[PDB]
Subunit: 143 residues, 2 copies
C-alpha cells in the first residue's frame, strides 16, 4: 500500500488520501484548466483506485486513478506528474504500480484514453491502441 | 426509473435488478463466451448504472451498464439486445436513456469502446471516435 521507490524520498501510495487543493495546484503546474473542487473530491471518493507519488524531504507530485466495475474493467484517468519531477522514471513507475494493483484485483481488461502526444509512452507499458479495430469514442466531446 | 417504451410491452429500468442467470442466457443468445457468474454479479453491484429492457406479456431482453467516477467520467459496457428483438429500435432507445441518465447526473464525458462493426451505430447516437487523435488503449488485449 505504501512503498518507497527512490532516495528526499519518493513514496508511492494507494491509500487515496488526496487533498483537493494539493491536487488543484498540481493540475495547475501541468497547465490544466481548473475544475470544481467538489467535483474533484467526488471523483476521488468514487474512483476504484487513487494512486499517488509524494516527495518528502510531504508534497504531492503525482497521481493516477481508475474507475472500474470490480471485475472485468478498469479505466485509468488523470495521470500526472509534477513537471519539475518528470524524466526521472516516476510516471513510468506510477503506471506500473497502478497496472499491477489492478491485476492484483483480477480485473480482466485495463483501459485508458490517450492523447496523441503520449500514446508511445503507453505502448512502452504494454498498452495497445485500437486492438482489432475497436475504437474509443466520446459523446459530443469538446477538446 | 421505470418507463414503458413500447406496446407485450417493453419496459426500461435503471433499478439494476438483474438475475445473473438471466443475463447469462441473454449473453448466450448473442453468442458471447461465458464468464464466471460471481464476477458478473460483482460487475453489476459495482456498476454506476445498470439499465435493462424487459419484455412482459418478465423476460430480460436488453442491458447496458456504465462505470463512472460520479463526476467527470462514465464508460458504457456490455450493451446487448436479444437478437429476436433487434431492429425494432430498442437498442437505440436503450442507449439514449443511458446517455440521458448519465447527463442527468452531470457526468462531463461519456465514453465507450466500440467494435468496428458497431461504430456507425454509435456515431448515429452522437459518439465520436478518436476526437483530436485521442486513442482508446487496452493493456495486452487478447481479442
Amino acid at each position: 500500500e505504501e512503498l518507497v521507490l527512490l532516495e528526499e524520498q519518493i513514496i508511492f501510495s494507494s491509500a487515496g488520501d488526496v487533498n483537493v487543493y494539493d491536487l488543484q495546484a498540481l493540475c495547475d503546474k501541468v497547465g490544466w484548466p481548473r475544475r470544481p473542487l467538489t467535483k474533484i473530491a467526488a471523483s476521488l471518493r468514487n474512483s476504484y483506485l487513487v494512486a499517488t507519488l509524494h516527495s518528502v524531504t510531504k508534497q504531492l507530485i503525482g497521481m493516477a486513478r481508475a474507475t472500474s466495475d470490480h471485475a472485468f474493467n478498469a479505466t485509468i484517468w488523470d495521470v500526472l506528474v509534477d513537471p519539475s519531477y518528470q524524466g526521472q522514471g516516476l510516471g513510468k513507475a506510477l503506471m506500473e504500480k497502478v497496472i499491477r494493483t489492478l491485476l492484483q484485483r483480477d480485473i480482466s481488461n485495463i483501459t485508458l484514453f490517450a492523447d496523441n502526444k503520449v500514446v508511445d509512452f503507453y505502448k512502452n507499458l504494454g498498452f495497445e491502441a485500437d486492438p482489432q479495430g475497436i475504437k474509443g469514442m466520446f459523446w459530443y466531446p469538446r477538446f
